[PDB]
Specification:
Distance between the termini of chain A: 32 Å
Structural class of chain F: mainly beta
Radius of gyration of chain A: 19 Å
Bound molecules: potassium ion, magnesium ion, zinc ion
Protein name (chain F): 60S ribosomal protein L8-like
Order of helices and strands of chain F: EEEEEEEEHEE
Number of strands of chain F: 10
GO molecular function, one term (chain F): structural constituent of ribosome
Family (chain F): Belongs to the universal ribosomal protein uL2 family.
Strand order of the largest sheet of chain A: 1-2
Strand order of the largest sheet of chain F: 3-8-4-5-6-7
Distance between the termini of chain F: 32 Å
GO cellular component, one term (chain F): cytosolic large ribosomal subunit
Oligomer: part of a larger assembly
Largest sheet of chain A: 2 strands, antiparallel
Largest sheet of chain F: 6 strands, antiparallel
Number of helices of chain F: 1
Helix content of chain A: 10-25%
Keywords (chain F): Ribonucleoprotein, Ribosomal protein
Strand content of chain F: 15-25%
Helix content of chain F: under 10%
Radius of gyration of chain F: 23 Å
Chains: A alpha+beta (98), B mainly alpha (25), C alpha+beta (97), D alpha+beta (91), E alpha/beta (132), F mainly beta (194), G alpha+beta (216)
Chain lengths: 98, 25, 97, 91, 132, 194, 216
RNA sequence: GUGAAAUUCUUGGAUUUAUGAAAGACGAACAACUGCGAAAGCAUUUGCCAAGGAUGUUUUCAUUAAUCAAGAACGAAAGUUGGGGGCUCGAAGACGAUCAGAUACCGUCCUAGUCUCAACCAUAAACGAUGCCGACCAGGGAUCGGCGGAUGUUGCUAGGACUCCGCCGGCACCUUAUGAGAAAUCAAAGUUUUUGGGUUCCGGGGGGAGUAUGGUCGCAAGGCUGAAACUUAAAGGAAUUGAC
RNA sequence: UUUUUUUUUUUU
């Protein structure tokens, strides 16, 4: 039985797509199929923001940000709970969670 | 048995049979 | 493009192919532009350049060897150098300077 | 008529030395006896005089090249490397 | 060196991997090493070398040593393993940074210097990845 | 007797009215009528002879001098070359990688010809018969054919003798074994396949 | 034995192009035998924030490389040796649903300084734009790259290193590139992302001292 | 380095820090339910060489066309022969772990290989598990290329970017049954007992078996073509409930 | 993300 119209990937009008390496396990996975997330978070966690600001060596200074593009294979994504198993009707929803 | 390994076993058997064939001509 | 201009000259104008004819045209002042290929021997190239300097004629160094120059001219033989006596419908003489 | 199915030049060796060795030496036999383009006069008249020596019958230029080919593969790489280094030094 | 309030700036390279933590203090050029304390120099078990507590202890030792050499402020160069491996800093990075901030040293510029390939050599583990 | 071709080069004598004739090991790509430039200020072109101090790193050279002025002892065989690795101005020494893979330090004043030795790929061709080897070694020395030690009698070889053909003792010998006893694999750190 | 007890301190001096001359302090082992403190300090490269150099936090996204050309007294005089964007700045600039255009050019200044310049730009949405993406066609990208290369080559070749760094500080070249390329496609965040020195002229004490004031 | 360790490297300075050089791979981020190509496949810049779809056309020929035994071109990865390269990773192999055992999963070091050239190999879940050409057949919003029209801005040089309305072609998507279906689902898998537009291939319960034999291709590995004796009541597809 | 192998024939 076929359970996904797209076949679990995002290839249309295309022969082959080069793979990426899972950021967790390193498994090869087609890029159009890998679960991709973009994390933009302060380098200093909110707990240490106050201490770092107090220890700042300049009159004013904006703390930088860390940008990370995580590309997970299906197994790693499910295990780490980046994605979860959804109902038959719910898995057709493509909009991101609020 | 996995079909892949069954095919590998069959190829080994075919090679052995061909070697026996060629031994006696 | 130089190759297309040379093809236009070949089809519609007057030209001479070969070292001896090039020297003859330079001596007679009939030639207006001398094209020399990369493959041309250094001494022959220097002599042609000196002749062109004496005759006050322009010299162009083709971006190819004698085989490529012959192919561009549309011939089945190597061309070391050539002289454009008159460009029929081309404007190489007016474009190169 | 197709005199030999696949032997070609190595047919002179008859049935000696083994098929693998005959096939291996076929490449050298063809290459060292083939004609090569002459960059100095634009003619396919370069022939091997002796191992590493290639003379042109038309213009008379003699070059040092490969044992069985006019230009070895590594020669082009060496020329490219030397050109890159010379450009770096000159700039 | 002249005034008490004058700030002498070093550079603290903080390498926060998932197996260890390095806090390496150098001059502005980076050619001179001032103090280098690792998380593995502060614990007994190999599994605690990258722990936040080990990072905090190493940072405290680094700050104490630097205060004797006269370094008042530190720039921060935080890195992960990088290359074709994980780009995520280890758990000890933040403990080290917080400890340095709390130890009375001033904090200057903070930069992520994880080596990011524009494109890398093959990552290890094979095409099926680490299987567990 | 030499795989690499040689090049005859005519120079103008620096301070005499005569021709200076030289015989160089030919580098691949050199031709008759070519101009060769030898000196510290010579351009970095294949066939030119330059002091190693003027040769940038990563360069391929041949016939590299070991001692300044020895006129070339390294990387002279067909298809062989040395690679310039690094320079040390403090002691004026250049590091080179030799054909065997060894790294050697030589004075930076040592000369070397740019490029690799011509005639490469000679050893790829199979000879297929004893006559080719006969012709090859006839112009080199009396070193062919070779008789196996186990085919001789004991009187003339340690491997000789026995009712079967066999060495009878380890073929690895001491580095200090006297002549006549030092046969087989001399001072072998290991044997067999990799 | 303590190795830091035999180390002397030196003050790093930036060229006259930057407002702030005092960059920081660096140490080296004292001269002993053939080991010279001056040779140890020679050709050292320091990475410094342009915000620190100009006392302006708006320039904190630029890193300047200063090389040590000479040592006089306890002062190490430096000169411009390249510049680079910061990782956070580049990551913030790069975004999805837009086109990224990059160019590079090798140029030489009037002082015989050969350098490679790397410029970056992004497509910009219009105020009334409704579609979710601003993608430029490949031909438009190629034209923009051609304009970038031409402008960078002209700007670098028409001036020396000092004036080139003076142009870099306020980002004039990026402004001119954006003005020229607006006729093809609106662009945003046009910058000279990186500059590296491929070759430098033979050291000249007079040329070095022109950009450094008297320290005495 | 691991769950924890050990093999391993380390005062002959390991790991880490800065600068520089060399080598070979790889072209991140941009990068998408987007593009090109007959498929395989194709992602750094610039130049050259030919090639191509769509669009526009009040240009030309006038049936020149559709699909195809035989016969041909290309054809991932692995693999073969011989050079060149050989950074990384890494079949085989060797060790350290885990285990009752562990020829593995995990870790460490590595040969062939991984890259390129010349010549072979011709097979993949080579998939949309869905031949090609043509006609009809509901709606809707996006998106790529070209074109037509309208309109207002632009730190720009009539144009380009954006806005709106349309036509043609394309990769797709959402809703729906008046359709089909064993259903899963399908806007083509519809217009089928109210059965017929043209045309190629190909299946006949499950195994034996893609085996034996013959032929043919290939250096080989194997590819293509391809049975029977005998055995058997099921195998199998979709979907429902429970149990796990 | 340590480790976790096995359950005679027919029938209900
Ligand atoms: K499917
Ligand atoms: K997916
Ligand atoms: K550890
Ligand atoms: K003999
Ligand atoms: K023998
Ligand atoms: K014996
Ligand atoms: K024997
Ligand atoms: K390798
Ligand atoms: K067990
Ligand atoms: K292996
Ligand atoms: K094959
Ligand atoms: K599929
Ligand atoms: K459309
Ligand atoms: K029973
Ligand atoms: Mg299922
Ligand atoms: Mg495919
Ligand atoms: Mg450890
Ligand atoms: Mg699992
Ligand atoms: Mg025997
Ligand atoms: Mg447009
Ligand atoms: Mg480095
Ligand atoms: Mg890229
Ligand atoms: Mg595109
Ligand atoms: Mg090979
Ligand atoms: Mg390895
Ligand atoms: Mg291969
Ligand atoms: Mg098949
Ligand atoms: Mg459109
Ligand atoms: Mg059947
Ligand atoms: Mg397990
Ligand atoms: Mg059991
Ligand atoms: Zn994974
Ligand atoms: Zn010739």
């Amino acid at each position: 039985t076929f359970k996904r119209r797209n076949g679990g990937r995002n290839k249309h009008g295309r022969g082959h797509t080069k793979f990426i390496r899972c950021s967790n396990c390193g498994k090869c996975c087609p890029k159009d199929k890998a679960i991709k997330r973009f994390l933009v978070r302060n380098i200093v966690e909110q707990a240490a923001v106050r201490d770092v600001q107090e220890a700042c060596a300049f009159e004013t200074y904006t703390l930088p940000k860390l940008y990370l593009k995580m590309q997970y294979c299906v197994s790693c994504a499910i295990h780490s709970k980046v994605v979860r198993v959804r109902s038959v009707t719910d898995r057709r929803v493509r909009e991101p969670p609020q | 048995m996995r079909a892949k390994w069954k095919k590998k076993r069959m190829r080994r058997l075919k090679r052995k049979r061909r070697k026996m064939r060629q031994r006696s001509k | 493009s130089i190759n297309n201009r040379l093809a236009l000259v070949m089809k519609s104008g007057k030209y001479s192919l070969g070292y001896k004819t090039v020297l003859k045209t330079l001596r007679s002042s009939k030639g207006k532009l001398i094209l020399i290929s990369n493959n041309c021997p250094p001494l022959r190239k220097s002599e042609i350049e000196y002749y062109a300097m004496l005759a006050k004629v322009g010299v162009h160094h083709f971006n190819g060897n004698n085989v490529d120059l012959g192919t561009a001219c549309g011939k089945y033989f190597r061309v070391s150098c050539l002289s454009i006596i008159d460009p029929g419908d081309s404007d190489i003489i007016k474009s190169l300077p | 008529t197709k005199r030999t199915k696949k032997a070609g030049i190595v047919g002179k060796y008859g049935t000696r030395y083994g098929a693998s060795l005959r096939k291996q030496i076929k490449k050298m036999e063809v290459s060292q006896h083939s004609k090569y383009f002459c960059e100095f006069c634009g003619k396919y008249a370069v022939k091997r005089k002796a191992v590493g020596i290639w003379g042109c019958k038309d213009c008379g230029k003699v070059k040092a090249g490969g044992a069985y080919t006019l230009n070895t593969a590594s020669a082009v790489t060496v020329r490219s490397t030397i050109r890159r280094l010379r450009e770096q030094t000159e700039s | 060196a002249t005034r008490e309030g004058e700030l002498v700036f070093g550079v603290a390279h903080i390498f926060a991997s998932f197996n260890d933590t390095f806090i390496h203090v150098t001059d502005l050029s980076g050619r001179e090493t001032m103090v280098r304390i690792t998380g593995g120099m502060k614990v007994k078990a190999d599994r605690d070398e990258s722990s936040p507590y080990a990072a905090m202890l190493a940072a405290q030792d680094v700050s104490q040593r630097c205060k004797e050499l006269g370094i008042n402020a530190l720039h921060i160069k935080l890195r992960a393993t990088g290359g074709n491996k994980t780009k995520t800093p280890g758990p000890g990075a933040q403990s080290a940074l917080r400890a340095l901030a709390r130890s009375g040293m001033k904090i200057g510029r903070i930069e992520d210097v994880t080596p990011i390939p524009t494109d890398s050599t093959r990552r290890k583990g094979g095409r099926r990845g680490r299987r567990l | 007797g030499r795989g690499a071709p040689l090049a005859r080069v005519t120079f103008r004598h620096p301070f005499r009215y005569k021709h200076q004739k030289e015989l160089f090991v030919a580098a691949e790509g050199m031709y008759t009528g070519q101009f060769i430039y030898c000196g510290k200020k010579a351009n970095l072109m294949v066939g030119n002879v330059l002091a190693l101090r003027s040769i940038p790193e990563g360069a391929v050279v041949c016939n590299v001098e070991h001692k300044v002025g020895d006129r070339g002892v390294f990387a002279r065989c067909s298809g062989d070359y040395a690679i310039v690795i690094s320079h040390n101005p403090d002691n004026g020494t250049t590091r080179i990688k030799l054909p065997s893979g060894a790294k050697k330090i030589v004075p930076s004043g040592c000369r070397a010809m740019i490029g690799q030795v011509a005639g490469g790929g000679r050893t790829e061709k199979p000879m297929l018969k004893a006559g080719n080897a006969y012709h090859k070694y006839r112009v080199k020395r009396n070193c062919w054919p070779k008789v196996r030690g186990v085919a001789m009698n004991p009187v003339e070889h340690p491997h000789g003798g026995g009712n079967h053909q066999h060495i009878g003792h380890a073929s690895t010998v001491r580095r200090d074994a006297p002549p006549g006893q030092k046969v087989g694999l001399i001072a072998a750190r290991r044997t067999g396949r990799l | 034995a303590d190795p830091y007890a035999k180390k002397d301190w030196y003050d790093i001096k930036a060229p006259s192009v930057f407002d702030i001359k005092n960059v920081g302090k660096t140490l080296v082992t004292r001269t002993q035998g053939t080991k010279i403190a001056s040779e140890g300090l020679k050709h050292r490269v320091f990475e410094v924030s342009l915000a620190d150099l100009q006392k302006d936090e708006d320039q904190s996204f630029r890193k300047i490389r200063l090389r040590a050309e000479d040592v006089q007294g306890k002062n190490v005089l430096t000169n411009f040796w390249g510049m680079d964007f910061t990782t956070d700045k580049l990551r913030s600039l790069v975004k999805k649903w837009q086109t990224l255009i990059e160019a590079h050019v090798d140029v030489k200044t009037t002082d015989s300084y050969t350098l490679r310049m790397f410029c970056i730009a992004f497509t910009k949405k219009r105020p009334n734009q409704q579609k979710r993406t601003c993608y430029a066609q490949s031909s438009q990208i190629r034209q923009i790259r051609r304009k970038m290369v031409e402008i960078m080559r002209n700007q670098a070749s028409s001036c020396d290193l000092k004036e080139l760094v003076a142009k870099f500080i306020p980002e004039s070249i990026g402004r001119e590139i954006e003005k020229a390329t607006s006729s093809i496609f609106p662009l945003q965040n046009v910058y000279i992302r990186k500059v590296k020195i491929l070759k430098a002229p033979k050291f000249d004490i007079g040329k070095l001292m022109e950009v450094h004031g008297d320290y005495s």
